[PDB]
Design a protein around this nucleic acid. Structure first.
Ligand SMILES: [Mg+2]
Ligand SMILES: [Mg+2]
Ligand SMILES: [Mg+2]
Ligand SMILES: [Mg+2]
Ligand SMILES: [Mg+2]
Ligand SMILES: [Mg+2]
Ligand SMILES: [Mg+2]
Ligand SMILES: [Mg+2]
Ligand SMILES: [Mg+2]
Ligand SMILES: [Mg+2]
Ligand SMILES: [Mg+2]
Ligand SMILES: [Mg+2]
Ligand SMILES: [Mg+2]
Ligand SMILES: [Mg+2]
Ligand SMILES: [Mg+2]
Ligand SMILES: [Mg+2]
Ligand SMILES: [Mg+2]
Ligand SMILES: [Mg+2]
Ligand SMILES: [Mg+2]
Ligand SMILES: [Mg+2]
Ligand SMILES: [Mg+2]
Ligand SMILES: [Mg+2]
Ligand SMILES: [Mg+2]
Ligand SMILES: [Mg+2]
Ligand SMILES: [Mg+2]
Ligand SMILES: [Mg+2]
Ligand SMILES: [Mg+2]
Ligand SMILES: [Mg+2]
Ligand SMILES: [Mg+2]
Ligand SMILES: [Mg+2]
Ligand SMILES: [Mg+2]
Ligand SMILES: [Mg+2]
Lengths: 80, 82, 205, 129, 122, 156
RNA sequence: CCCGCAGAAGAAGCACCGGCUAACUCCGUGCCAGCAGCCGCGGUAAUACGGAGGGUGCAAGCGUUAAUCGGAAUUACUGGGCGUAAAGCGCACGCAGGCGGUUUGUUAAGUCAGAUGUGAAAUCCCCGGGCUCAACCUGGGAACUGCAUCUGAUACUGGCAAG
RNA sequence: UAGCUAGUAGGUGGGGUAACGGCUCACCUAGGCGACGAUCCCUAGCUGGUCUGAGAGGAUGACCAGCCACACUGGAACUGA
């Protein structure tokens, strides 16, 4: 078991790379309402396997570029 | 290196030393790794005044920690008393 | 740090006898105890809620001879302590060393007792204690030291005390001039005229 | 739109008690039935009766004691605009323990006291006094 | 009011301006009397109230009341000003301190001497 | 044993052809120290008469209050038009932590340990009315047991 | 720290007293001089100005000024409101967003439970101990409402599938 | 203050670092950030804590301790663990 996060692929244009929103459903500090917050992450994906809209599991790793410190581990729900 | 030494605390003319493990570079009362005892030089009779956790001290020494002269003296005193 | 003014003046203002005189001579003979001090004494204005609370607090403070900052500290300590706050405050005040000396009878007034304590006449557990605010604890012996044991004031005070009502919470030996503070008094043990509740409200406005 | 059926049910109960209605009827649901069951157990209503197959109707029989309503107050707490969840140490005591608080736990809808006894929190549906 | 609305745009604390902004959160400040004059009070009062328009060390040009009966002030007279308005001079927000630099203590005062910079008589 | 105390005395005026007619209103509150409290609002041309009228009114139309060991039975809110009031039971020794009017009403009622606050308007008559209403409505555990058809032990 | 010496000897002021707010009189002035935190006071009987006597409150301090929170439910999450007091867009359509009737299955994201790790020491609080007492110092606890990971529960909310 | 960015975003390969890395360079791709506030402007050392408050909050960051930055102003490296 390794630490990993799931997220929808917000973009897949930059080659070998995808952007993966990691929406978390946090509670508001004061008002107590539960707000959908988002976390964009530049994820490395070799072979350009991922599509846009694709759900994808990712893990943290040594930084591969200026913005890219995550790698994909497995794709799920990769329908179009 | 890591050392075991007294840190001065208390009031003016009434010192109370906290025995602390700390990186020698750090200031006397500053950053410290572990607090492994105390020593109260003005402590009266019918008071403990000294207390050194000897096991922890032994462990740190094993790790390679130097000991202040005063702390060494305290250790000797504790051993004799016990 | 001490009130150095007229004492029957304070008593008249309060209404009650605050025991600021030895009690050889009656307060009615020493002053117009009924009439309040000053040009406008012969008048009793209707007192507000704040006013009544303040008067009670003043009474207690005068009785013991504690200034306001010290009194406030006492109240805070009492509040912090578990149980009833007014009761705690009364207990602390009683606990004071000058007060215990007075109760034992090594002084006609608390002013006299305080003087003795300041001047180093009183030993607590065979150790000369000098502070009047010193909290005496249960099972504490408190004694006149020999140099003050020859004092005619001390013996006179003892006689007066014998006349007075003896406290249940102390045990005192007149020949030895030593008394054991067995326990801090309970509210039923202290005087009923004191309305501690007013004081609590005032310091909890 | 109807956006809160539990709230609607609570409101119906309140209005019935106000208006001295003997029974109150509303579209049945499983959550509603569970809440009703809890209410009956605690004794704030006399009875409930689900009736129908295609679109079933819950019928609660309301409770009166001395001419006046048994359910003195009945407020929704968690609601769609603002969900409320509490932990076992944070579970509320309604009317200092006299009234009950309906709590949806992992082990089904139960009163606050029951939930506390079990040792788990959940969605605080409503207070009833 | 709606929880969503609050989340969107939270509640603004009511930023209270100071009523003595020339002090600039100082308890007093020194200044030089640009001009010393008397002025008329508001509609429930009649007087000739003594006041001095003063340039402060920090640039501000304020107006300052001069309390007490009589004063030894004139142009180019270095004074200390403090907080406090004359409710009845409109726009006067500051008092001079009697018993400071150029300002003298009040003459022949026996009460509130501390307020008017007067030393204790024998 | 019917302790009574006057909360507020207020002078009110009427205008007539001649000029103004002044009169006094007295809001008093009486109570037996075991649960019963009642307030009264008297009006007369002079203060003592007004107070007497108020006292008579208060003495009649009292109301019973379920007190648990000299304290409230549960936290209770109360409103009366502007005066919205909150009052909460507190541990023995807390004393009455309550405003003016509120303090009076509670004390005569016989509550020895309460935490109160008056929100909204603090107009004495309305605030007293609010407090009495809140105290009246406050039910006990025996009452809740009776209503729900259980024992008091099942409810606790 | 202790012992001795002499002698009440060397040691009390500051503010306030119309209401809020504990404490009142006389004289002087006469909308002047002045006061004032608010409301107000003073135009010839001023408990409000100034002096005096008397009193009240603090006391080696006492007032004033500045500053923050409180009271202030006066930005209202707890905890407000919008017919006439300030406040419903002139009316609609509609994207983002917020919310979502009812049943079953599934997931376990929110939620809940347990554990583990961490949350420096000091500080705060509790029971003790040491300075004659206190302040102050100090032993041991409690707390640090948090965060992370793992293992569960699945009623509710979310996702997915069929109705 | 609604658009900002060309080493800019990503890739391949060299170089460089004690170390990963547009850190740097050549080429390729045309990306990347942004109404969950980018960019721009004003203010500010951060925290344990401190004051206040029933709490939730509000204000604050002297002293003591942890972290950071600076050393007349602006750049630069050398020596060295
Ligand atoms: Mg002092
Ligand atoms: Mg402004
Ligand atoms: Mg006038
Ligand atoms: Mg008065
Ligand atoms: Mg004055
Ligand atoms: Mg005259
Ligand atoms: Mg006159
Ligand atoms: Mg006045
Ligand atoms: Mg005067
Ligand atoms: Mg507020
Ligand atoms: Mg409003
Ligand atoms: Mg309008
Ligand atoms: Mg309209
Ligand atoms: Mg639904
Ligand atoms: Mg949706
Ligand atoms: Mg989960
Ligand atoms: Mg700590
Ligand atoms: Mg001790
Ligand atoms: Mg589900
Ligand atoms: Mg579902
Ligand atoms: Mg490279
Ligand atoms: Mg290379
Ligand atoms: Mg700066
Ligand atoms: Mg800085
Ligand atoms: Mg508050
Ligand atoms: Mg500094
Ligand atoms: Mg540097
Ligand atoms: Mg340098
Ligand atoms: Mg310089
Ligand atoms: Mg340089
Ligand atoms: Mg070297
Ligand atoms: Mg080198």
């Amino acid at each position: 078991k390794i630490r990993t996060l799931q997220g929808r692929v917000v973009s897949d244009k930059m080659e070998k790379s995808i952007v993966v929103a990691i929406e978390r459903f946090v509670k508001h500090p004061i008002y107590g309402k539960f707000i959908k917050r988002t976390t964009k992450l530049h994820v490395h994906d070799e072979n350009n396997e991922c599509g846009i809209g694709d759900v994808v599991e990712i893990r943290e790793c040594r930084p591969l570029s200026k913005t890219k410190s995550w790698t994909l581990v497995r794709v799920v729900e990769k329908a179009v | 290196m890591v050392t075991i030494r007294l840190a001065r605390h208390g009031a003016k003319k009434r010192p109370f030393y906290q025995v602390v493990v700390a990186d020698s570079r750090n200031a006397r009362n500053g950053r410290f790794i572990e607090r492994v005892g105390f020593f109260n030089p003005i402590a009266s009779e019918k008071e403990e005044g000294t207390r050194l956790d000897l096991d922890r001290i032994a462990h740190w020494v094993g790790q390679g920690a130097t000991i202040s002269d005063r702390v060494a003296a305290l250790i000797k005193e504790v051993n004799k008393a016990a | 740090a001490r009130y150095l003014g007229p004492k029957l003046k304070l008593s008249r203002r309060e209404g009650t006898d605050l025991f600021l005189k030895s009690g050889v001579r009656a307060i009615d003979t020493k002053c117009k105890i009924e009439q309040a001090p000053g040009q406008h004494g012969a008048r009793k204005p209707r007192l507000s809620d704040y006013g009544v609370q303040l008067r009670e607090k003043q009474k207690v403070r005068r009785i013991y001879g504690v200034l306001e900052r010290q009194f406030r500290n006492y109240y805070k300590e009492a509040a912090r302590l578990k149980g009833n706050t007014g009761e705690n405050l009364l207990a602390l005040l009683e606990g004071r060393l000058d007060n215990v000396v007075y109760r034992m009878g090594f002084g006609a007034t608390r002013a006299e007792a305080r003087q003795l304590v300041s001047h180093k006449a009183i030993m607590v557990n065979g150790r000369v204690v000098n502070i009047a605010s010193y909290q005496v604890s249960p099972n504490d012996v408190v004694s006149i030291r020999e140099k003050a044991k020859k004092q005619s004031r001390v013996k006179a005070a003892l006689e007066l005390a014998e006349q007075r009502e003896k406290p249940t919470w102390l045990e005192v030996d007149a020949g030895k001039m030593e008394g054991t503070f067995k326990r801090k008094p309970e509210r039923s043990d202290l005087s009923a005229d004191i309305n501690e509740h007013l004081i609590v409200e005032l310091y909890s406005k | 739109s109807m956006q809160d059926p539990i709230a609607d049910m609570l409101t119906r109960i309140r209005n019935g008690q106000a208006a001295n209605k003997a029974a109150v009827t509303m579209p049945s649901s499983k959550l509603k039935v569970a809440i009703a069951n809890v209410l009956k157990e605690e004794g704030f209503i006399e009875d409930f009766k689900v009736e129908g197959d295609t679109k079933p109707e819950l019928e609660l029989t309301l409770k009166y004691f001395q001419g006046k309503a048994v359910v003195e107050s009945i407020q929704r707490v968690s609601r769609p605009g603002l969900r409320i969840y509490k932990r076992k140490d944070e579970l509320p005591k309604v009317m200092a323990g006299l009234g009950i608080a309906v709590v949806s736990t992992s082990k089904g809808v139960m009163t606050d006291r029951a939930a506390r006894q079990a040792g788990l929190g959940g969605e605080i549906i409503c207070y009833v006094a | 009011a709606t929880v969503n609305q609050l989340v969107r745009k939270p509640r603004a604390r009511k930023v209270a301006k100071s009523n003595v902004p020339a002090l600039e959160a100082c308890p007093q400040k020194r200044g030089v009397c640009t001009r010393v004059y008397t002025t008329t009070p508001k509609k429930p009062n009649s007087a000739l109230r003594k006041v001095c328009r003063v340039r402060l060390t920090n640039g501000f040009e304020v107006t300052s009341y001069i309390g007490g009966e009589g004063h030894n002030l004139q142009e180019h007279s270095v004074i200390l000003i403090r907080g406090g308005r004359v409710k009845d001079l409109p726009g006067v927000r500051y008092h001079t301190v009697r018993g400071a630099l150029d300002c003298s203590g009040v003459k022949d005062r026996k009460q509130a001497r501390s307020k008017y910079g007067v030393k204790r008589p024998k | 044993e019917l302790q009574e105390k006057l909360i507020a005395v207020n002078r009110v005026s009427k205008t007539v052809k001649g000029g103004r007619i002044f009169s006094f209103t007295a809001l008093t509150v009486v109570g037996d120290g075991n649960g019963r409290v009642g307030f009264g609002y008297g009006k007369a041309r002079e203060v003592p008469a007004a107070i007497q009228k108020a006292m008579e009114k208060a003495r009649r139309n009292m109301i019973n209050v379920a007190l648990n060991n000299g304290t409230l039975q549960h936290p209770v809110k109360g409103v009366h038009t502007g005066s919205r009031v909150f009052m909460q039971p507190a541990s023995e020794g807390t004393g009455i932590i309550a405003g003016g009017a509120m303090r009076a009403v509670l004390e005569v009622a016989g509550v020895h340990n309460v935490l109160a606050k008056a929100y909204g308007s603090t107009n004495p008559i309305n605030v007293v009315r609010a407090t009495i209403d809140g105290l009246e409505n406050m039910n006990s555990p025996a009452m809740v047991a009776a209503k729900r058809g259980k024992s008091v032990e099942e409810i606790l």
